Design a protein around this ligand. Structure first.
Ligand SMILES: Nc1ncnc2c1ncn2C1O[C@H](COP(=O)(O)O)[C@@H](O)[C@H]1O
Ligand SMILES: N[C@@H](CCC(=O)O)C(=O)O
Length: 529
RNA sequence: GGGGUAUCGCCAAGCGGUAAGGCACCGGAUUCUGAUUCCGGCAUUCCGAGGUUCGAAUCCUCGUACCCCAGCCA
C-alpha cells in the first residue's frame, strides 16, 4: 500500500468512484528509462489490482521535439515490462479539434485573449518570484477581436512568436503558473501524427486536464514538479463545459546512484556518441537494461521494493543489483567460461580427453545435467594461480592442490614464464581418480568468446549535479575481454542468461554476436566479499 | 513570494498507547561456485526547542534544513 492507494480506497468507500481509471502519458521525445518503469508499475498495477482500466497516451503537443521512432519504442517497452493498456493507444493529438473548440469557449467566455507581446516581453511582464506581474496592453480586446485574431493564428496568418493565446487569470498571483498562462503557440512544424494540418499547438497545461477528462481518468498520477500546476489543471476544467473532473496526485520521482535519469542528458550521451545508443547496456533505459540482461520481472520487483511516496530519494545501485541477482540465482543455468585464460597442462594425463557430468544448477537437480569435455590441456583464469601467498588464499598454489570444478584434483609443480617475466603455462599432475575449487575450460573443445564486462557509467554518485557531467564518465564502464567457454554455449540465444560459475551472470547478443564470434554481456557479478 | 518534504548508511511502515520490513553492514553454521542457504546482531529513538496528555514519531507553538516554480518545454 502507499498514500495513493489509500486515497483510492477512501474514494471507493465513500462512493465518489466505483471504478478506477488511470493512465501512463509519456511524451514521445526519447526512450523510456527505469524512472518511467516506476510510473508504469504504479499506474498499470493499480488498474489491475482494483479491477480497472489504464490507458497509454502519448502527450504529443510539441512537434519539434518528437519523433515516430519514439512512439514505437515506448509501446515496445511497456509491453516487454508485462503490461496491457485499455483500448487503442491514445494521443493528445486525437483531441486537437476538441482542444481548439474549448479554447473558443474560453474566448467567448472572456477568459482567454490573443496577445502580441514578443517572447521576450512576456517574460518581462511576468513579474518574479517575489514581485508581481503586470497586464499586457492587449489583455482587454473584445471577444470579437480575439476570435478573429485566433483564427488568423490558426490559418497561419502570424509568424512564429508574433502572437499567442493566453488565459486571462491573475497577473499578481503568488502561483506563477496562473499569471495568464499561454494556451497556444505558433509552430510551422510537421507533426508525426497530424502532418501539416495544424500550425498552432496546445500547451501541456491546457491539454493534459482536458485529455484526462475526455478519457474518463479518475486519478491522474504525476511527479512532484507538477504540484503548482494542479491549480491550472483545476482552473481549466472548472471553466469549460465538461462533465467530469479528474483529481491529480503527485509522487516523488526515482533517482539512481551513479547515473543520470533525464531525457535531455541521456539524449546527450546518445547524440555525442559516448554510448552506442539508447539501448547501450550501460544505459538506464528499459531497452539498455533489457540488452544488459535484466528480466522484466526483476524490474517490477525493484519498483515494488522502492515504494511510492513524496520524499525525494536516491536509490543505491546495490538495491537494483539485488533484484536481478535474486531472479537469476534461482533461474539461471550454470556453465563454464574463462575471461582471462592461461594454459595449464596435466603432464600426468593420457589420452585425447574424456567427458564429465555437470549439473545445470548446483542446488536444483530438477533442472538436469550435461556432459562436458575434460582433458590434459585446459584453460584456467590467471587470478586462480598463485606461486605464493597467504593462508586464506584457497586457490591453486605452486605447491598445493585444488579441485577442478566437477572434475579432478590437480597439483601445481612447475611453471614457465616469458621475456617480460609473464607466465605462459602451468604444469600440473592430476589424481587418476578424485571425483578450494576453480572453474576451467578444455583448450581442445573450447569456444572462442568475447566477454564484455560492464561497470557504473559515471565516476561519481550524483553525476547530474556536476558542472559538466560528461567529464565525470567512467573510462572503465566497458572493458572487453577475449576468453574461452565450454562448447555447450554454442547454442546460446539472445534472451537467455547463464551463470558463469564463480564470475557472474552473462547473456548473449550485445547487438554484436555472430555465429563465428559470440559476444557475451556481464549482467551483474556475484556477491564478492 | 508560493508550493512541498523532514523516522537506521540507502529506501520505507507508523494516522495518541508506548519504533514493521527491504537493500547494506557485523558474527556463526552448511556448501565441489570464497555464490547460494542458513541462525544471530544492528534506531530507549523518530530535524530542533517548548507545549497538551496518564501516555505522542503520531496534536499545538516557534524554529531549522533541503526540494520545486519567473519555457510561446513536459
Ligand atoms: N524519474 C522518474 N520517476 C518516476 N516517474 C517518472 C520519472 N521520469 C519520468 N517519469 C514519468 O513518466 C511519465 C511521463 O514521461 P515524461 O513525459 O517523458 O516525463 C510521468 O507520468 C511520470 O510518471
Ligand atoms: N506529461 C507529464 C504527465 C504527468 C501528469 O501530468 O500526470 C509528465 O511528463 O510527467
Amino acid at each position: 500500500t502507499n498514500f495513493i492507494r489509500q486515497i483510492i480506497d477512501e474514494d471507493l468507500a465513500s462512493g465518489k468512484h466505483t471504478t478506477v481509471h488511470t493512465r501512463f502519458p509519456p511524451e514521445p521525445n526519447g526512450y523510456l528509462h527505469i524512472g518511467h518503469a516506476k510510473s508504469i508499475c504504479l499506474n498499470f498495477g493499480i488498474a489491475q489490482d482494483y479491477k480497472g482500466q489504464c490507458n497509454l497516451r502519448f502527450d504529443d503537443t510539441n512537434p519539434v521535439k518528437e519523433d515516430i521512432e519514439y512512439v514505437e519504442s515506448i509501446k515496445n517497452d511497456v509491453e516487454w515490462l508485462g503490461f496491457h493498456w485499455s483500448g487503442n493507444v491514445r494521443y493528445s493529438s486525437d483531441y486537437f479539434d476538441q482542444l481548439h473548440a474549448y479554447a473558443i469557449e474560453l474566448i467567448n467566455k472572456g477568459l482567454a485573449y490573443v496577445d502580441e507581446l514578443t517572447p521576450e516581453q512576456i517574460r518581462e511582464y511576468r513579474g518574479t518570484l517575489t514581485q508581481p506581474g503586470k497586464n499586457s496592453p492587449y489583455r482587454d480586446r473584445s471577444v470579437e477581436e480575439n476570435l478573429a485574431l485566433f483564427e488568423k493564428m490558426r490559418a497561419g496568418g502570424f509568424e512564429e512568436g508574433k502572437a499567442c493565446l493566453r488565459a486571462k487569470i491573475d497577473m499578481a498571483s503568488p502561483f506563477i503558473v496562473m499569471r495568464d498562462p499561454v494556451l497556444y503557440r505558433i509552430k510551422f512544424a510537421e507533426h508525426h501524427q497530424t502532418g501539416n494540418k495544424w500550425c498552432i499547438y496546445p500547451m501541456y497545461d491546457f491539454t493534459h486536464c482536458i485529455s484526462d477528462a475526455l478519457e474518463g481518468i479518475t486519478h491522474s498520477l504525476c511527479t512532484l514538479e507538477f504540484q503548482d500546476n494542479r491549480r491550472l489543471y483545476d482552473w481549466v476544467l472548472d471553466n469549460i463545459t465538461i462533465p467530469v473532473h479528474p483529481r491529480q496526485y503527485e509522487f516523488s520521482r526515482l533517482n539512481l546512484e551513479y547515473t543520470v535519469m533525464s531525457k535531455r542528458k541521456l539524449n546527450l550521451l546518445v547524440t555525442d556518441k559516448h554510448v552506442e545508443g539508447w539501448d547501450d547496456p550501460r544505459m538506464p533505459t528499459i531497452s539498455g537494461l533489457r540488452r544488459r540482461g535484466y528480466t522484466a520481472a526483476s524490474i517490477r520487483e525493484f519498483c515494488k521494493r522502492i515504494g511510492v511516496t513524496k520524499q525525494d530519494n536516491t536509490i543505491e545501485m546495490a538495491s537494483l543489483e539485488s533484484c536481478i541477482r535474486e531472479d537469476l540465482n534461482e533461474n539461471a543455468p550454470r556453465a563454464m567460461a574463462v575471461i582471462d585464460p592461461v594454459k595449464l597442462v596435466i603432464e600426468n594425463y593420457q589420452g585425447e580427453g574424456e567427458m564429465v557430468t555437470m549439473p545445470n544448477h548446483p542446488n536444483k537437480p530438477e533442472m538436469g545435467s550435461r556432459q562436458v569435455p575434460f582433458s590434459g590441456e585446459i584453460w584456467i583464469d590467471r587470478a586462480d594461480f598463485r606461486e605464493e601467498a597467504n593462508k586464506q588464499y584457497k586457490r591453486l598454489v605452486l605447491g598445493k592442490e585444488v579441485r577442478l570444478r566437477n572434475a579432478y584434483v590437480i597439483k601445481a609443480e612447475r611453471v614457465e614464464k616469458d621475456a617480460e617475466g609473464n607466465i605462459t603455462t602451468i604444469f600440473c599432475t592430476y589424481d587418476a581418480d578424485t571425483l578450494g575449487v576453480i572453474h576451467w575450460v578444455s583448450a581442445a573443445h573450447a569456444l572462442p568468446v568475447e566477454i564484455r564486462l560492464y561497470d557504473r557509467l559515471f565516476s561519481v554518485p550524483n553525476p547530474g549535479a556536476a558542472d559538466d557531467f560528461l567529464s565525470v564518465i567512467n573510462p572503465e564502464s566497458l572493458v572487453i575481454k577475449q576468453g574461452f567457454a565450454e562448447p555447450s554455449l554454442k547454442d546460446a540465444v539472445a534472451g537467455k542468461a547463464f551463470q558463469f560459475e564463480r564470475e557472474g551472470y552473462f547473456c548473449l547478443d550485445s547487438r554484436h554476436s555472430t555465429a563465428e564470434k559470440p559476444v557475451f554481456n556481464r549482467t551483474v557479478g556475484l556477491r564478492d566479499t
